[PDB]
A paper describes a structure:
AMPA glutamate receptors (AMPARs) are ion channel tetramers that mediate the majority of fast excitatory synaptic transmission. They are composed of four subunits (GluA1–GluA4); the GluA2 subunit dominates AMPAR function throughout the forebrain.
As already apparent in the two-dimensional (2D) class averages, the signal encompassing the NTD tier was diffuse at low pH but was well defined throughout the receptor at pH 8.0. Atomic models derived from the consensus refinements reveal differences in the LBD tier between the average LBD structures at pH 5.5 and pH 8.0, with larger displacements of the BD LBDs versus the AC LBDs in the pH 5.5 receptor.
Numbering used by the authors:
A (entry chain F): 5 to 42, 55 to 214
B (entry chain B): 524 to 551, 567 to 671
C (entry chain C): 573 to 773, 784 to 825
D (entry chain B): 721 to 770
E (entry chain A): 623 to 720
Amino acid sequence: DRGVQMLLTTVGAFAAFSLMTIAVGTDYWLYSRGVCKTEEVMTHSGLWRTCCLEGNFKGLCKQIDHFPEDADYEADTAEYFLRAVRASSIFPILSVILLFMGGLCIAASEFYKTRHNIILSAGIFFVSAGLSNIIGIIVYISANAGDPSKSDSKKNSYSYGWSFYFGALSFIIAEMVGVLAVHMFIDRHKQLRATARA
Amino acid sequence: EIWMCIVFAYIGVSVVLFLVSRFSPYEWSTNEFGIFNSLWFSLGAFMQQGCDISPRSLSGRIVGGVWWFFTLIIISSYTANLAAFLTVERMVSPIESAEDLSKQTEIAYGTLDSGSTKEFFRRSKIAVFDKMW
Amino acid sequence: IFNSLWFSLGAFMQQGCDISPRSLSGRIVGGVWWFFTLIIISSYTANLAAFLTVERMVSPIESAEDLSKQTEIAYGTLDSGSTKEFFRRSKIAVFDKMWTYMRSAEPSVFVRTTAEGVARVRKSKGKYAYLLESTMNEYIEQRKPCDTMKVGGNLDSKGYDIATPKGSSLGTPVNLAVLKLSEQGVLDKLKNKWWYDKGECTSALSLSNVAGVFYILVGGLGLAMLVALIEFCYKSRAEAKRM
Amino acid sequence: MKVGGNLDSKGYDIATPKGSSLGTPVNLAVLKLSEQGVLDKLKNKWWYDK
Amino acid sequence: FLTVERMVSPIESAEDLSKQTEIAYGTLDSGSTKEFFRRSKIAVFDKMWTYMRSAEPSVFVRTTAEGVARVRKSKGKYAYLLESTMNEYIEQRKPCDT
């Protein structure tokens, strides 16, 4: 049914957008021992700052420095490019923006019933948001492999938090909603052709 | 992380293939790439088990080609790393420092009930020994 | 022309083909391409396995005997001091062969003093090792830029003592004081304060090893989507003008 | 197996009576043995060689 | 399997025998062969002598006939050190298992 499909698509789009927004903002991305305001202690690393956990200075959210220029080293250009991409968090933010645009397209689709191309644009935005979320996850993990505290699971035993899994769940919902949006675009054009046949 | 990203890439590839195969009304269906069929195609491509259908459009073929390259690289890497693991034996010690014993709790540790070692830990000003003691 | 490229790509990736050549020449082309693909893919897998295995068997030097047998990395002591005298007079089968290596070696592994000998290790990008006191080794390990490290255990045993003139009233009380500090742990705390408290410093394949294939996959997905929308827009504009 | 470094520093010494004629020559004997590596050889013989 | 088989290297010199310990080696219980190791200071030779002197069970053999017999009965886990001229002669004798 058109109504239940639209309701499910709207609910899923809102859920994915909220999950992505929470994941970007929240700092429970990774559990790893680190030093606040660079004493080492267990911390929950996020996307911009990491706060001390069960430590002497517990609650100190030290900002994550993405350019360790202590040794004044540059190495290759690719490492600097990856560090810059991680630091700006361009891809999770782009995923959030694309999810918002898809949601606004879905909302505006009700106002403009005769314009079926809006629903297709919403589906494209949702799929692109999922792709950007995938890129962001890949870049995040790759840059995390640079530092020993976020790597070496054998000894460090780092753990991913619920905020990271919120973004993982956000990608799945956005892809699921993108399937529904394309299905509704297909149904709308099929109905238009069926009406013209009569 | 590799397995998680493999699952995510599989889902994304399936969705993108379904979208590029059936979104255009001017292609209406000539192909059989529904969402279920797209998921089946991607799963078969990843396991290198062939396919009952193949994409015919340029976009669907680009999606299939990049997924095939990804699958080839990933399967070869899995086989190579399994061979490396089965060839070389790497036995490591879970504990190699005093501070590591203090940090963990699964492995117990103790000293003489009466001796110099007891007084060393009972009276100590280093951070590690107190956490140990 | 378009379907031939698709067949060749599918054959190279060893994936399911929708069509197969039926003529003799087409089948010859397919067969030689299949043989080439089989050889190339097997070669890639075998070379990757060799890379990973050889990297897995690599073991860094930890002890002196490990350093003694291998010759790729040079090592040497000071031009003077007790380091050479220890090796020259050593009768241990491990240490003596190290002394013979340094005596006959070009360029001279011996350094004028510790200052640039440590810098020699720094500028040798891991190809040269320096032998010196453990206490000073730990100090440099804890100083900027934190690029040198101490491996293994001590080759011999020495000690630093409080020096007092022979026949002095401060001999016995100082000796008792030194033991009292060691028993209480003051000496250990002082060593920690001036070395570490004031210091300035797996097997499975990781995502970093295969990040490029993920980037290529997502870029291909984006390019395919862009092509699909371009085709759809062109078809819509063509149909709109016709109607 | 033994893992990690030593926690502290301790030594074994040759006990002698207070104010005895053997106190001094024994001290030089131990120090002289250490320089020539006899003590290292003696430890190696009874620990690793045997 | 294939890589490990390719990495397998049989012992080929005195040094290779000294480094490993799975394959035991012995000498005559009394003779010039035993005296050679005792009054030896070269790093390869004396390193074995520490093993030979302190070994359980004793690797020394009373008679040369028993030593060669033990080599054959040990299916390759035991090695015999003896004069080259007699070693070559036995190698050409039946059943040609040494």
